[PDB]
Amino acid sequence: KEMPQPKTFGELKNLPLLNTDKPVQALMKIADELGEIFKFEAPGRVTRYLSSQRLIKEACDESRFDKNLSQALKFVRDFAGDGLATSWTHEKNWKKAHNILLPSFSQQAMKGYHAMMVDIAVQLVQKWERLNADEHIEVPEDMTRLTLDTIGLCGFNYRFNSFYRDQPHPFITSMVRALDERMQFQEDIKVMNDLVDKIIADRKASGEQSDDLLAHMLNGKDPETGEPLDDENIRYQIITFLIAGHETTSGLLSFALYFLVKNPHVLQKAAEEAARVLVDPVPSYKQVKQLKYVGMVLNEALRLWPTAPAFSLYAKEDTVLGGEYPLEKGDELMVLIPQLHRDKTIWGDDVEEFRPERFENPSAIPQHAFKPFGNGQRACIGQQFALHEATLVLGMMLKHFDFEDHTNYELDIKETLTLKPEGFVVKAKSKKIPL
């Protein structure tokens, strides 16, 4: 079978279609028009965009397809090197760092992060308790303050102190300008390097037994090779986790809140759970695990707007995809996750409705139908960290405040490496429950 291809532009082929600030949303509309698979060509390259669970289930076969570095990740690799997200599976440092860092996301490790997640969650609740009458909240801005502080503190024992600031941290500013200006740069790379230096120097100076992610980066040994990470790769991993560890979680929290204010019955059901479960001034680990409906809200927000919306794969060998599309070794595929998550054959006709109850019986979901954390051994290592943080925080938000969509906010999805509802604002009226 011959694959459909969207409109072309002479020798530029399909390239000009990506000349937009919202390329994923542009590719979603192309998928709506052309279906489960289309060819996308640019001078010198081809990729195939997949949107159905029928095809993505095969693409996720690790015997046949491995993670490819997208154009975006190739650029990110200029700063994150062979850290986990930007390494090829076949690079020695991928498996080495994978093995060393996996224990930093075990159940025991998650329980270890809980108190420091609460520290930051409490700073967010106090900020909003302290606003004057009629003041509003800039949602993605505050969520980014919380998620950046949480990975800094939990992962590295470093305080970004984002809630003490009006404009984001110089690390964040430098990380954007500096990569930006790769597709002053001197002073920016210096901001990044200095911070990495400091995170390392301070742990080394401290007379501190710690079992955090940094501790594993610095001291853990890979059981396979028996080697620890070398200093160059540790730096890459710190950069990798400071970024990967916060931007997509902030997106998720922002979309979740957006969907709750747009669906007041769902908000009321989630708020009732928060009030029933979170019976103490501080949530416990056990109580966060009992926020089942809040977890479903989060999953349903990842269904509609997965905040890392695409991942790339290459064919390990010549193979046939879906009984119909022959591929050659090296051929690239792109999984368009928001489109996968709208596959009517899986989810029913109401795919654009926000209905967390879709996730009541998750064993009913077919293989590879829901992929917001990627696939296989190259799946998100931080999935449980993101979900624990976002469950804790959204549960606290719903326990402490009523929310108003006071502007009747029109969804505007800004695309970076991640997705966010740009300009999303709300008002939060305190329920006056002490911390």
Ligand code: HEM
């Ligand atoms: C809701 C929030 C998050 C989402 C949706 C998400 C999504 C993803 C996706 C789709 C991938 C696969 C990328 C690819 O195949 O190219 C990935 C990998 C990765 N993520 Fe996450 N992520 C989230 C949060 C986090 C957090 C909190 C951390 C760190 C604490 C993190 C660290 C990583 C790392 C290191 C990888 C690379 C793993 C490897 O290839 O070995 N992510 N993530």
Ligand SMILES: C=Cc1ccccc1
């Ligand atoms: C936030 C985890 C992650 C990793 C790679 C790309 C986008 C997101």
